[PDB]
Structure 1
């Protein structure tokens, strides 16, 4: 499933609680292979958990990276990777 367009939104991906934490330089180069980045920002909370925010035009190609880091885990296994696109509708 891949249809529909939108020219008034900002499409971004949420990746947090992750081992090592992908820094902005590596998410620009290795995550730009998988889809087309317009910005990549590091936002971090007071609980010691780090997040990276990844602004992509296409989810369906970036889906290789997102499944390859998939397995979001909480409460003693640390590993959150999630699309708010759901492969794009």
Structure 2
């Protein structure tokens, strides 16, 4: 017991194992075992035991990207709301793209906020669709995710 594909995906969470001639004829088939389940995870691997792992939870309830190494940036952030900036308008402007675990905004600076989604990708969609524009009655700027490495 060695060449050990820990599944932790949408579908199945509970490993499977095999053994092979090189531990790469193992990968190249673990690849398809997990792609049949519906996973591409982290694709992590270990060489000291020749174990593997696919933790797709790292794209759902923890986070990553392939741009730097954070999801996007450290939290949800808003500013330039200087004509209006309040919690309610942002609670529900972000509420559309996903639910909020946390929310807050300053009256001074004139219209600056911060919030918490967990998801990094509906957060990147609020950068796609709520940054660069106008929210409520302003000339916005906006930045979102939840983490992680800066």
Unmatched 5+ residue regions in structure 2?
1-40, 43-57, 64-73, 134-138
* Number of residues of Structure 1 aligned to a counterpart in Structure 2: 76
Matches of 2:78 and 2:110, distance apart in 1: 11
Residue 25 of structure 1 pairs with residue 58 of structure 2: no
Unaligned runs of 5+ in 1: 73-77
2:37 — aligned with what?
none
Matched, 1:39 2:102: yes
| Corresponding residue for residue 52 of structure 1 | 113
SS state of the match for residue 37, structure 1? Answer: coil
TM-score after normalising by structure 2: 0.38
Scaled by the length of structure 1, the TM-score of the pair is: 0.58
Moved over 4 A (4+): none
Aligned-residue CA RMSD (Å): 3.4
Give, in whole Å, the separation in 1 of the partners of 2:78 and 2:105.
10
Q: By percentage of residues, which structure has more strand?
A: 1
Pair 35,22 (structure 1): closer, same or farther in 2 beyond 3 Å: farther
Q: Following the alignment from structure 2 to structure 1, what is the Cα–Cα distance between the partners of residues 115 and 80? A: 15
| Structure with more relative contact order (C-alpha pairs < 8 Å, separation 6 or more) | 1
